[model samples]
Target: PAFWCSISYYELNQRVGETFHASQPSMTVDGFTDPSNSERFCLGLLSNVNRNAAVELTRRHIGRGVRLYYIGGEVFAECLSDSAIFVQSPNCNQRATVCKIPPGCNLKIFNNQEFAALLAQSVNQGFEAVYQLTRMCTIRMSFVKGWTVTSTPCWIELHLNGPLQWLDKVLTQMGSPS
Candidate 1:
């Protein structure tokens, strides 16, 4: 079965910024760099930021009905390594000062277990809203190219949500593959 979901990346970023402001300044990272080089190298950085933001956002709004499942640390680590290769290159590492954070450090350092714990607490407290939003994200991804609902039952449920019924109809009308 296909599932649909939504995640406002912008909202995630804003939550991260807010959380960083209240917590240690050490958590925040710079926004701009050579788009070409950084874009190639910054996938880890971006993923780290997104993960952190998701955790924070889920926590703060947990009581309001957000549910979050942890993304596996091992998978995240792989993404971090990919990010490091891009950022630690001579061309990018030398410019680390501009990108925020010390040169030669991997972005994954910020995504330690402690941070994951805090995020988990947040999600446990507000699972409903988080679950709904994540569902939206799943549906969105299913509609996008190169992504499909896998073996996860959560995704199957998302595909069955009433709001997403129209999506299937629309896609069918468009003659898109399922």
Candidate 2:
């Protein structure tokens, strides 16, 4: 597919080894947490308290989490959860900024212009430069939680594959000696 992204779960700082490679136009991340025998393009996080309770009640607490949509090569996230979702995107983190999206609100999580600028800046610089750009391409978001060491909340890191994959091609052509 022309549009692709990755959603990797994170418990505090360490990755939880659960990742979803999305190729659809829209996707959901909810509290289902159990993908035993499903073929849908949804992600289930293991942060729900009522794991065995009714599915409706379990999702009602979190309001079905969030929805991601691919539009014009950019990623937009809509907060379907009643609890606010804290987001830290590449554009915001440059100044160490963070934004919160309330339920029913949506915003662009990744920007194409920022990606284009970062790619142009990487050519003259070294590998570390491109590596840092890779980090910039990643968007960190926490569900119903704040980003702090004191609070252990369920968070996920969204990697923009389009730009990062292109960076891989650029690195191959550069032929780094490492």
Candidate 3:
């Protein structure tokens, strides 16, 4: 159980909040006020890079597939890497750089070539773009920790970067209505 911890939701919400001009805990615009938006927002936001949705939450399963190595209800685990699993210099204010992970991470491959193609073009899409890009880059999202309910959760922790800036359009569209 020494793979690693995923980032925190707070961090994801905070970053997107800036782009969307909203706050965390994801809600809708009128409901945009909600914060974490649940399936309506936060999930949509994280969808930008979510592979299986399971990986982002923090509780990962090597197999089903956890087959957990339960020590008790109280055991702490930590993993150290000379570098990181995937992300390099992630910043919400800027276009973050991505890479491949050698190990100790969950990978959700998307577009691959086209993903790089979009990045090379310097085009800023939104979460869907992000979702597509992540698929391609062999995109692996790591973190400090997430759900940790004895499974791989996707709370998110690191200050991340993506196509950021997705709101104006979505707002006019249809959200959960809070």
Candidate 4:
């Protein structure tokens, strides 16, 4: 007897998209109705995580403020108030390698605090190359009375490689935030 296993990254991505829409009312209603608006919100999620080097980086920048841009190749760039703050990640990159880190070290940072800590650790370790970290890590964003609210539920599992790990700790500790 032989045992075989196969993973469908594309299918997982589709589920993530579905979970995102199902969980976020703003996305399901306004976002679906207005493609531009949906893109804007999705872009916001990406930008907030990248530029700030935090899980959620939101700030006004030179009037233009923070925005998200999809650069194809599974890469999404977040332009913060300060151009210097802009950052990119495989998670955001459409073509980003599924589970492999490049020659440089790869650190997983949950949000702002974790990102900072990781950066400091990298500096202390004297790491030369750019260490990759994934952010804009969306758990779930919701809406109430025309305002946006967020929640973390089974939806997160739709994308996570091993949903149990995330549910056990990450989601519990982080929950949902603006």
Best by lDDT: 2
- Those runs of model 1 whose alpha carbons end farther than 4 Å from true positions after fitting are 1-99, 105-112, 128-178
Model 1 has an lDDT value of: 0.23
Error at 31, model 4, angstroms? 6.1
Residues 5-62, candidate 1, lDDT per residue (tens digit)?
2122222213212111111111112222222131121111233333554343323321
lDDT of each: 0.23, 0.68, 0.28, 0.24
**TM-score (C-alpha) between model 2 and the true structure:** 0.74
> How many residue pairs of model 3 clash at the backbone?
36
How would you encode candidate 4's per-residue C-alpha lDDT over 1-178 as one tens digit per residue?
0101111111111222322222221121111212334323222222111122211212121222222221111112222223122122223232222222221222231233443454445444432311233222332211111011212110112122222232234334443455
Candidate 4: minimum summed lDDT over ten consecutive residues — where? Answer: 1-10
Question: What is candidate 1's CA lDDT for residue 157?
Answer: 15
Regions more than 4 Å wrong, model 4: 1-31, 38-110, 128-130, 134-178
Runs off by more than 4 Å, candidate 3: 1-116, 119-150, 153-159, 166-178
Work out the TM-score per prediction: 0.19, 0.74, 0.20, 0.22
lDDT (tens digit, per residue) of candidate 2 on 76-165: 889988887878886545534678899899988877777777777877787667767777668877777655622434667777788778
Q: Candidate 3 overall Cα lDDT vs. reference?
A: 0.28
Task: Return the lDDT, model 4, position 59.
Answer: 19
